[PDB]
Symmetry: D2
Subunit: 488 residues, 4 copies
Amino acid sequence: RMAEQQLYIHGKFVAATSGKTFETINPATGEVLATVQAAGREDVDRAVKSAQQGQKVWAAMSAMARSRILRKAVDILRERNDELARLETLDTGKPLSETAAVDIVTGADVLEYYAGLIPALEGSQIPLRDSSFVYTRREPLGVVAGIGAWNYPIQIALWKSAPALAAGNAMIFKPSEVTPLTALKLAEIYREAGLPDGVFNVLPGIGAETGQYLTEHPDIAKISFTGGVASGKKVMANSAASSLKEVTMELGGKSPLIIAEDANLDLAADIAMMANFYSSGQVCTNGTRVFVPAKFKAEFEHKILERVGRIRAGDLFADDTNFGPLVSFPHRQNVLRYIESGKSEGARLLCGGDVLKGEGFDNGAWVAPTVFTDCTDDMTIVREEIFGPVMSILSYDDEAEVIRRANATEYGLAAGVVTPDLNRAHRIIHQLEAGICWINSWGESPAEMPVGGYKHSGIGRENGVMTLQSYTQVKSIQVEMGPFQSIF
Amino acid sequence: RMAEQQLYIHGKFVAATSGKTFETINPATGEVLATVQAAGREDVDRAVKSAQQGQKVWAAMSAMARSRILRKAVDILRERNDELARLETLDTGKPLSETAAVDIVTGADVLEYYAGLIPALEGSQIPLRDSSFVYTRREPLGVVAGIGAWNYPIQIALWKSAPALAAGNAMIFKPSEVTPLTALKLAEIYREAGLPDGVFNVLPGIGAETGQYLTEHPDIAKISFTGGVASGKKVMANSAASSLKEVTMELGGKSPLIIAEDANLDLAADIAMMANFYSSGQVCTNGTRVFVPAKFKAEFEHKILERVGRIRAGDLFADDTNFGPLVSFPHRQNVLRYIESGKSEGARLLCGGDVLKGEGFDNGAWVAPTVFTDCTDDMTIVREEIFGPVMSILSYDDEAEVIRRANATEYGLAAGVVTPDLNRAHRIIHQLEAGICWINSWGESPAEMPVGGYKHSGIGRENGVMTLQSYTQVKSIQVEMGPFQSIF
Amino acid sequence: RMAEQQLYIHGKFVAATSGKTFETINPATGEVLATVQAAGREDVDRAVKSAQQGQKVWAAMSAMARSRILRKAVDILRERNDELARLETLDTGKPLSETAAVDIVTGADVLEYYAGLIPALEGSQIPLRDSSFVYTRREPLGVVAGIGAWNYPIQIALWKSAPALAAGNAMIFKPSEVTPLTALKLAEIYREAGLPDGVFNVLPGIGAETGQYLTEHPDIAKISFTGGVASGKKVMANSAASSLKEVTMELGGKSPLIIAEDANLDLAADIAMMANFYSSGQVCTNGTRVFVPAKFKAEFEHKILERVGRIRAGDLFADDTNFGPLVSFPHRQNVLRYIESGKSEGARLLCGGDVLKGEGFDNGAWVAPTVFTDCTDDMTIVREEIFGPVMSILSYDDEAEVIRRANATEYGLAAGVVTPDLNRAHRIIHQLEAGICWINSWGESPAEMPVGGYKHSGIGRENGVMTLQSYTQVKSIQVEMGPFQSIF
Amino acid sequence: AEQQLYIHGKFVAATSGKTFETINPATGEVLATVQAAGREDVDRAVKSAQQGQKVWAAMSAMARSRILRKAVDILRERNDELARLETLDTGKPLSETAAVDIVTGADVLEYYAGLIPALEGSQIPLRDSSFVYTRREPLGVVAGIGAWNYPIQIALWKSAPALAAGNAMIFKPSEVTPLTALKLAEIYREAGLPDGVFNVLPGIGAETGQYLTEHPDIAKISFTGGVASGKKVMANSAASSLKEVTMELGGKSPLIIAEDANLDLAADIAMMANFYSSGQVCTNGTRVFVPAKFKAEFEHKILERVGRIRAGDLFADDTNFGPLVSFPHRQNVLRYIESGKSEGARLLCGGDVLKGEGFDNGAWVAPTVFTDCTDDMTIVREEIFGPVMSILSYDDEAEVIRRANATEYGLAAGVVTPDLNRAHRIIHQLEAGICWINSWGESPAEMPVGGYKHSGIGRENGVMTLQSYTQVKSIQVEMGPFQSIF
Ligand SMILES: Nc1ncnc2c1ncn2[C@@H]1O[C@H](COP(=O)(O)O)[C@@H](O)[C@H]1O
Ligand SMILES: Nc1ncnc2c1ncn2[C@@H]1O[C@H](COP(=O)(O)O)[C@@H](O)[C@H]1O
Ligand SMILES: Nc1ncnc2c1ncn2[C@@H]1O[C@H](COP(=O)(O)O)[C@@H](O)[C@H]1O
Ligand SMILES: Nc1ncnc2c1ncn2[C@@H]1O[C@H](COP(=O)(O)O)[C@@H](O)[C@H]1O
Ligand code: NA
Ligand code: NA
Ligand code: NA
Ligand code: NA
C-alpha cells in the first residue's frame, strides 16, 4: 500500500484543507492502493491563485525556454515509462502490455509534439490601407482546468496539459477519483523538468465537489473535459451558470466499423477485435457496431470466435496477458445489464456474456469478452455506448444502406471502413458523420491528427496544430496612423 | 402598417402554426410597425428539416458556385442599400446617416469577403510513414442557428450567415423580436441570388419560446448568439442540457478608452465621442469608461462638452441628424435607472441626464447625450453595461494603475488607447484583457479582423478567416497501407 | 484579314518604334492572320515606366477594390468566351471544341479564384518577449514580366497575370510570336474591367529581341516563363547576367502513365488517349510514355487503335472535330524528325507516322495521330519531348521496375497511375518524381491545385494559394520597445 | 593538421591533389592546411547524399527532430571550444563568437527541429467524386555555399531547414574560413544524423563551388556572399541543370535617425550597425542618415562611443573589436577609406591600420567614420564590408526615404524614432526585407530574412524557409468515371 497522497499546489505536495479523503482501489485485487486527500473549495481558490502567479512567469519566458522545459519532461517520461505504466496498471486494471506501450508513450508523444510547435505560434498582420493596419496576438487564456477520465489517466492528463502549457497557460487538473495516482506523479515530473511553480496543479477529489468547485470558479477561463455524457452535462451546466468559460468535451460514441464486400475477412476480424476488446472495451473510439455483408457474416462470425478464444485474461503484469478487469464493480454491473438486454431483446449471444470466476478473478470486476450477432438497429446494445467488451455484429446488403445506418445515431466520434478498393474507401469515409476515420486500421491517434467527435460525442478537438491554437485567444489590434474623423 | 409578417422556410414565406404573434414598434413615434408571427415548436422542426435538405444541395455544389451565389446577394444588397437602411431606421431608431452608410455596407462587406474565401477552405495532409498518411476534411457542421440582437439587425444577420453559408452550412436565423424586419428581407435576397431553398430560413419569435426551441433541437450542430449577458447564460445552459452543440457568443462589454498624458485632447475627445454616442450608445464595443489623466481632466471635460453641443438630434431621415432615440421605451427606462444610480452615488453630471422633450421628441424614446465625471470604479454606472448614451469619465494618475483598473472587470470585449508614443501604444494594448483593441481610433471592424470578447464578453470570434473555419468541423482520415497488426 | 496589331502600353494601343514587324499564320490554311508590330528596347523601357506608375495606383487601392475589378474582368471573359475561343482556334489551330470549353474557361477560373483571395493575403506577427515583437508584410514585387507559350496562349496569360495582379503587381506580358492575338484582347478586357493603366501591358515580339530586353531590364523584379527548355535556359542566363530577378519556369516533360495489372483496359486506353492526343499532342503535361504490363500490352494496343480510328480531324470550327493541325509547319518538321527516329531506331509504328493529305489538310500543318510500341528506354522518342501526337507504349514486368523507369528521366512535370487498388494508387504515386499526379484520370488542373515540375521540368509553381504569395515579397519588421544595449 | 573532406560520415582524402591555407588574421600565421574538393569529390558527396537522404526521409518526423535536437545539445556543450576555433579562423573576438555565432546557429537548428512534425500538405475537395491532396516532398540533395563572416552560423542556418525538410545538404564553406564547418559535420554524425546527409567539401569557389552549381543531381543552391560571386553562381547554375537558387547578398542599408530621436540611442544603434564584427556584416547600417540640426551632437556622441572601442587580444574578455578576415580584405577596406578623402568626405576618426605591440601582426583597420558625406561618393553607394560608417545629412522625411531607397541594394533598414506613425510609416515605404525600429541586428529564428532587389533572392529563417526546402506534389484522386472525347 502507498503513503497518503496529498494535493499538488505550487510546486510541492500540500495537505487539503477540506478534511476529506477518498480511497483508490486496485481493480484486480480490491485492495486499497492509497488513501487520497480531496480538494475543497478553498483549496481550489488557492490553486487558482497559484496558477495565476505561475502563468505570468511561464508566459513571460521565451518560446524556446518553454519548449526546453516541456522536452525535459518528455525525457523524464521516456525514462520512467515502465514504472509509470505499472502504477497505471495498478490503478486502472489495464494490462501492463497496454500501459507500457501506449499510455505514457502516446502521452509523451503529444507533449513532445507541442513543445516543438511553441515557437511557431504566430498571429497575423492585415494591411487595411497605407495609413492603417491590423495585427493579431494569440494570447494565453490564463488559467484553464482539465477534468480527466479513468480509462487513460496519464494520457488524458498529458493530452490536456501539453497544449495548454504550450499555449502559455497554467492548468489545474482534476483526475478521476477512480485513478488519481499518475496525475500526481506527472505534476512532480513537470517541476523536475523546470516548470514554474503553479503552472500545473493537481487537485484530486470527487466530481460532485472538487470538479464542481473548478467549473464554478470565476477565474478559470476554459474547461476541457473527457468522461461520460452525464458528468459532461453537469460540467456544462455549472460552467454556463458560472463565469462564461470555453468548454471542450470529449465524450463516448457508438462508432461504426464497415466491412466491405471486397475486404479480406482475416484483416476485418483483426480490426474488429482491436476495435472492441482493447483495454477490455473501455475506450470511447471503439468500433462497437460492426457492419458485415450478409454473404460473409457467417464466416466473419467464426473468425471472431477463433480470435476471441485467444484473449488471455490473467496476471496484469504478465507479458502474455492482453485482457484486464473492468475498472470497478459498479461499471461491470452496467455492462452486465446491457448484456442481459441483448439476450432479452433477441440478439444471438455468440460468446461470453458472464462474469469470470475462479482464483484471480473473484476479487476483480472481470467480464468475459462478449460478442452479439443477429443484431438490429433498434436493440439497446446497438444504440447505446456500453464501455465494456461487447461487440455487436450487424448485417447489411448495400453501400447506401450501411452509410445511412452508420450515420443514424446521435453519436459521432469515430468510424472505419475495411476495403482494398480506392474509390470505395474514400467514397464511404467522406459520407460518414464522424470526426475520426480509419481506413483498413483502427485506434491509431497520432499527435499530428486532430481527434474529436461529431454531434453529441464532443465539442472541439484534441491534438494537432489547431488544438494548440484553441488554448489561445485572439486579440485584434488596429493601428490607425491617419487622422481620426468624428461625425459629432 | 405592414401585412402580418410570416416565417420564411424553404424559399418562401409561410404561416406559423403557433397561433402566436408579436408586434414591433417604431421607437421614433411609438407606432406599431408591423405584426409578426412567432415560430412554434413544430415550426422549428420544419425549418430544421428544410435546412437539412437545402444544406445537402448547397454542399454538393462546387466552391466557386457557392461563391458566385453569395456575390450575387452582395450585389443585390448594394443596389438596395438605401431601401434597406430606411427599414432599419424605422425598426431600430438609428439615423439614416448611420444605417445607409454602415449597417448594410459593412454587412455586405463580410458576405463579400467570405464569398471569395470559399475556394481556399482547405484541409491538411500529414505523412506518418511510407505506408500510412493522414488527410483532413473541413466539413460543414450541417444545420446551424443564429440568434440576433436588435442594435445592428441586418449587419448581425449577415455576419452570422455569411461564414455559415460560406462553410457549406444552412442557417436558421431568429432575429430579435424588437427588430425582426430586415432579416426577413435578407432571406428573400439570398433566394433571389440563387441560394438553394432551406439554406437560410428566418423564424421570428420570442427568446423564451422560439429561441429555446432552436437551442434545444437535437439536429442543430452550432448556435451563434449575440445579445446580453443574461440571455447568453440561458442559451448556454439550455444548449448544455440539450444536444451538445458548438456555441459562439458575442455579449456586451464595459470597454475602456485610455487617454494618455501625451495625447492630443481634441483627438481624444473625438474618439471618446464616437466610442459612446454612435447609435445612441447602443453598441457592445463602446468605450463607456473613459480614463483621463488627472492633469488633463478639466480640459478634456470642456472638449467633451463642445462635442456634445454639436450633436444634432431630430428627424431620423434628415442628413444632418446624427443622434437617434433608443430602440424601445422599456430600454430607455432601464437607461434612466442607470442615470439615477449615477446621481445617487455622487457622479457629477456634466451634461444630459434626462429625456429629450418638444415636438418630434416627446413621442420618441429619446435620452439626451449624457456624461458623468468624477466617476469611480465601484459605481454601478461604471461597473455595468448601460447600452445607452452615457459616458463615464474616470481620472487616473499612472500607467500601471490605469491598466489594472481597465482590466478589473468581468467584461473583455474592446479597449483603446490614445497616444502618439510607439512604445506606450503597444505596451498598454498588449496588457489589456480585450479581444478588440483600437490605437488612436475606435469602432472600425474590418471583415478581415477577428472580433470577440475575453472573459464574460463572449465565446469565440466573428469575421476573419478563422471564423470561416469555425463553421466547419474537422474530420481526420488515416489511410493505412501497411499490414494491420492485432495483439489478439 | 485583321488590321495590323500594335503594342498595348498604358491602356491604349500604340505603335512600336522598332520599325520591325512579324506575321502570325493560320495553321489550318497557311494564310497570314495579321501583321504584328514588334517591341524594341525603347518600347520595353516605356512599358516599364508605364508599369511602374500603374502598380502604385493599383497597390494603393483596397484589397476588395482590386478583387472587384478582377471579377469584372472574369464576367467579360465569360461573356466573350466563344469569340475569344474562335480567335484562339484561328491563331493556334486547336479545335473550337477545345478552345471554347477549356482555354478561356480555365483561364477565367484562375483569375476568379485569385480575385477572391486578395483579402486573405496576410502577413504574420511573432511575439519575441514582452518588450519586443516582429510583424511581417507581404508587399508587391513591383513590375513582373510574363513570357507565354503558343499552345495555350490566353490561358497562360491569365494564369500568369491573375496571381501577379492579385498580389498587387503590374505585369508586362510577352506572347509567343506564333500566337500573339488573344493576349492583346485580354489587355483590352482588363481596361474595360477597370484595371489601372500600365498594370497589364502586352508587348508582342520575338524572343531574341523583345523577350531578351524584358529579361535584361534592371527594373523588372520577377520573370515567369512557360516554354521549351532551350528558350528557358536563355531566359535564365540573361536574367542572371542582369538585375537579380526571381525566375519561375513551366517547361516540358516526358510524363509517365503507369497502367497497373488490375486496371480496366478501356479506362486505361481512354486516359492514354486524352493524355496524348488532346490539342494534337501539344501539351506539356502529356503522358507520352505509357507503361503497360507485358501480359496486357497486346490487348491495350488493340483498344488504342480502335480509339485512334475514332479521332475526327477536319474543320476546326465543326462541332465534331476533335483533332487539329500543329501550330506551325516548322514545328511539324521537328515532329516528323522524331517520328523518323522512332522508325530508324527500331520502334514499331502501330498507326499514323505521316502527314495528313487531301482536301482540307494539304494547306494545314497536319500530322496523323501516331502510336509506337515495342519502345525501349534508350530510344529518342522515349527520352525526349516531341510536343506532337506521338504515343510511346512501353512494356514492364513489375512495380519496382516501372517506378525506376518512370523516374529515370531529367523531366519531372506530370505522372499518373491507373488502378482500382487503394494501396497501389497512393503507394506508386508517392514514389513518382513529378509535381502533377493524376490517379485514374488525366489533365484536370483546378485553380486550387499547385502545378509545376520536378527536376528539369520547371522552377516554382502556378495556381493554388502559394502562387499568390510567390508574387509578393516578405518584409520583416521588429519593434523593440525596450532599451537598446550596445557592447561598444 | 591537414584538414580533409567529410563525406558519408567520415573524413576522407580529396581526389584533387590540391590544397589551400587558412590564416589566423591576428598573427598572419597559417592556422591549418585544408584539402580542396575536386570534380570527382563533388560527385562522391552527391552520391553519398542521395543514399543518406532516403534513410533520413524514411524516418519519422519526430525521429528527425530528436536527432537535430541532439546536435543542438552537443553544440551548446561545445560552445566555447567551437567559438575559439571561430575566433582563430575569422579574427572575431571571442566575446562575439562565444555569444552569437554558435548560440544563434543552434537557435535556428533548435527552431527547425521542433517544426518538422508540423510540415503538412493540403487537401482540397473538388466535388463529391474527386479531391486533391498535396505532399511537401524533399527536394533531395541540396548544396549550400557559405560566406566567411559567420562561418558556422551560415552552415547552421542553411543546413537546419534543409535537413529538417528531409533533404541532404552538401555545404561548401568559404576558403577563408573552412574549419568550423568540418566540426559541425562531426557533431551531426555524433547526434545520429545518417551518413551522407551533411557532407562538407572545402575548396575554392572558382573550382569547388562551380562543380556544385553544375552538378545535374543537386536540386537547389543556397548562397551567401558578395554580389559578384553570386552572379557567377547564378550564371553557372543557369547554364547547367535547372536548380532552385537562393541568394543572401550584401547591402548598403540605411539607418534613419528621426528628429525626435534620442541621439544616445541613435549613436548606440549606429555603433552596433557599423562596427560589430569589425563592420564585416551584410546587414550593417553603413549609411547613417542624421538630421542636420543634430549632426554635430551626434558626431560628438559617435566620437564618445568610438573611444570606448577596445581592440586587443581576441581571447581577452574586454576586447570588442577584431581584425578583418584577411590582409587582402584589409586592402579593399583601406582602398574605400582613401576614396572618401579623395571624394571630399571629412574623416571624423580612424582611417588607417592599427600599429604597436599586438596589432602590427594582425589585419587591423581602425574604426572609421566619415561625415559631410554625399549620395554620390563611392563609399556611400557601394558596400565596403569594413568598419566604415558614413554619416549623411537630410532635411525632410520624403528625401531620406527616396535617398534610402535610391539604391539597387535592398537588404536591411532601420529607423530611430519614439513616434508611432513615423516608425511604421517610414518602414512601410523602405525597400528592404529586414527592418528594425529602435534597434539593429537582431535576427530571430522565427523572422524571415533576405533582400529586396539586388541584395538577394528568397529568404532564410522562419517557417516559410522550411517549406522552401520542400517541393509540392499535387495528387488528384478521381473517383468518378473518366470521360474521353476520343
Ligand atoms: N458534477 C461534476 N462536476 C465536475 N466534475 C465531475 C462531476 N461529476 C463527475 N466529475 C468528474 O468527471 C470525470 C469523469 O466522470 P465519470 O464519467 O462519471 O467517470 C471524473 O474526474 C469525475 O470525478
Ligand atoms: N432564453 C433564451 N433562449 C434563446 N434565445 C433567447 C433567450 N432570451 C432571449 N433570447 C434572444 O436573444 C436575443 C437577444 O437577447 P436580449 O439580450 O435579451 O435582447 C433575442 O433574439 C432574444 O429573443
Ligand atoms: N532568348 C529569349 N529570351 C526571352 N524570351 C525568349 C527567348 N527565346 C524565346 N523566348 C520566348 O519564349 C516563349 C517560348 O519560347 P519557345 O519555347 O521558343 O516557344 C516565346 O514567347 C518566345 O518568344
Ligand atoms: N564562381 C563561384 N562559384 C561558386 N562559388 C563561388 C564562386 N566564387 C566564389 N564562390 C564562393 O562563394 C562564397 C562567398 O563568395 P565571396 O563573396 O567571394 O566571398 C565562398 O564560399 C566562395 O568560395
Ligand atoms: Na484505482
Ligand atoms: Na422595432
Ligand atoms: Na498563329
Ligand atoms: Na581565415
